[PDB]
Enzyme design. Structure first.
Site, PDB file in Angstrom:
ATOM      1  N   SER A  58       4.398   3.732  -2.693  1.00 30.70           N
ATOM      2  CA  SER A  58       5.520   3.772  -1.763  1.00 30.70           C
ATOM      3  C   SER A  58       5.223   4.504  -0.461  1.00 30.70           C
ATOM      4  O   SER A  58       6.072   4.459   0.438  1.00 30.70           O
ATOM      5  CB  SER A  58       6.736   4.413  -2.438  1.00 30.70           C
ATOM      6  OG  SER A  58       7.271   3.545  -3.413  1.00 30.70           O
ATOM      7  N   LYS A 113       5.808   2.469   2.619  1.00 32.95           N
ATOM      8  CA  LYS A 113       7.123   2.194   3.187  1.00 32.95           C
ATOM      9  C   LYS A 113       7.258   2.794   4.568  1.00 32.95           C
ATOM     10  O   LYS A 113       8.047   2.307   5.387  1.00 32.95           O
ATOM     11  CB  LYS A 113       8.209   2.708   2.240  1.00 32.95           C
ATOM     12  CG  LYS A 113       8.223   1.891   0.956  1.00 32.95           C
ATOM     13  CD  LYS A 113       9.070   2.476  -0.156  1.00 32.95           C
ATOM     14  CE  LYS A 113       9.107   1.490  -1.303  1.00 32.95           C
ATOM     15  NZ  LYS A 113       9.432   2.112  -2.618  1.00 32.95           N
ATOM     16  N   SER A 152      13.109   5.767  -1.601  1.00 33.82           N
ATOM     17  CA  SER A 152      12.005   4.936  -2.067  1.00 33.82           C
ATOM     18  C   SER A 152      12.504   3.635  -2.693  1.00 33.82           C
ATOM     19  O   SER A 152      11.898   3.091  -3.616  1.00 33.82           O
ATOM     20  CB  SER A 152      11.109   5.700  -3.040  1.00 33.82           C
ATOM     21  OG  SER A 152       9.750   5.340  -2.823  1.00 33.82           O
ATOM     22  N   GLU A 212       7.006  -5.527  -3.220  1.00 35.67           N
ATOM     23  CA  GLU A 212       7.415  -4.746  -4.376  1.00 35.67           C
ATOM     24  C   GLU A 212       7.855  -5.672  -5.507  1.00 35.67           C
ATOM     25  O   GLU A 212       8.500  -6.697  -5.258  1.00 35.67           O
ATOM     26  CB  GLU A 212       8.575  -3.819  -4.032  1.00 35.67           C
ATOM     27  CG  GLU A 212       8.291  -2.810  -2.976  1.00 35.67           C
ATOM     28  CD  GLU A 212       7.437  -1.675  -3.471  1.00 35.67           C
ATOM     29  OE1 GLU A 212       7.002  -1.712  -4.646  1.00 35.67           O
ATOM     30  OE2 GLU A 212       7.188  -0.757  -2.668  1.00 35.67           O
ATOM     31  N   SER A 247       4.511   6.627  -6.062  1.00 32.54           N
ATOM     32  CA  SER A 247       4.104   6.682  -7.454  1.00 32.54           C
ATOM     33  C   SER A 247       3.837   5.260  -7.915  1.00 32.54           C
ATOM     34  O   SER A 247       4.438   4.301  -7.418  1.00 32.54           O
ATOM     35  CB  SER A 247       5.159   7.380  -8.325  1.00 32.54           C
ATOM     36  OG  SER A 247       6.408   6.728  -8.269  1.00 32.54           O
TER      37      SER A 247
END
Ligand SMILES: *[B@@]1([O])O[C][C]([C][O])O1
EC number: 3.5.2.6
Length: 261
Positions: free
Chosen positions: A43, A46, A103, A139, A210
């Site tokens: 992440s 992002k 996230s 994702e 993560s």
């Protein structure tokens, strides 16, 4: 250096692979540990998607207020904010905040779509001089973090330089830069990572990551009280696919860096 011996010892104690890049903007000095090795971003990517949309908004002045429909089909595996707006809309600003501060994976996928796919996120990286970043997937599969897989990776050195440019430099317009800084400072997921290794008086803006293989990442801009800001990237990944997160390793690396100045 003492700091590199302590980071190497931390790594050895942890069982995994640790990557660190510190930029001290006071004298533009760098501290690197596995600084040019690739790590899965998870992440932390992002930040690049949000920044790319912010860059678009410099020309499309109302872009951030554009409503985007959240449909049930859009939901993926981790959507704390988007779930609250299913069958409704969120603006691109709200999606950027959700991607960064919570996230949210659905928010990330909407940002990727706005950019024309993962290639549009990567293109923004190239446009601001990052030749290392690559976003290949959406994702949630960009978090597979398979050892040796170059997809969806960057290096600590590259990410530190890029985060510096986006937040402290002028890769973005003045209003966009301030917005990104505001968003990062409001992150809600970072209390146990870099922040936990630093003095409580220091202001931090960060983005965690993560993934599988116990991948545990954090990238941060740090404003110490009365002192030039620092950019700190800490990436960590492990040899077992089902390994547990090790946010304590990132806190410890931050503590070691902070001690050494
Ligand atoms: B990033 O890494 O932060 C949380 C989500 C979990 O899928 O991705």
């Amino acid at each position: 250096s003492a700091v590199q011996q302590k980071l190497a010892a931390l790594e050895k104690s942890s069982g995994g692979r640790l990557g660190v890049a510190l930029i001290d903007t006071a004298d533009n000095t760098q501290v690197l540990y596995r600084g040019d090795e690739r790590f899965p971003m998870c992440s932390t990517s992002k930040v690049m998607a949000a920044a790319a949309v912010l860059k678009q908004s410099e020309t499309q002045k109302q872009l951030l207020n554009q409503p985007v429909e959240i449909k049930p089909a859009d939901l993926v595996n981790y959507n704390p904010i988007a779930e609250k707006h299913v069958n409704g809309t969120m603006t691109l600003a709200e999606l950027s905040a959700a991607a960064l501060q919570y996230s949210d994976n659905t928010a990330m996928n909407k940002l990727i779509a706005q950019l024309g796919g993962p290639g549009g996120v990567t293109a923004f990286a190239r446009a601001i001089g990052d030749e290392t970043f690559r976003l290949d997937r959406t994702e949630p599969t960009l978090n597979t973090a398979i050892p040796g897989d170059p997809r969806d990776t960057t290096t600590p050195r590259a990410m530190a330089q890029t985060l510096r440019q986006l937040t402290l430099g002028h890769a973005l317009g003045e209003t966009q830069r301030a917005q990104l800084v505001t968003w990062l400072k409001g992150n809600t997921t970072g209390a146990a990572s870099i922040r936990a290794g630093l003095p409580t008086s220091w202001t931090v803006g960060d983005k965690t990551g993560s993934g599988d293989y116990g991948t545990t990442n954090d990238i941060a801009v740090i404003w110490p009280q009365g002192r030039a800001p620092l950019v700190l990237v800490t990436y960590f990944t492990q040899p077992q696919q089902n390994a547990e997160s090790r946010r304590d390793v990132l806190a410890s690396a931050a503590r070691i860096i902070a001690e050494g100045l």
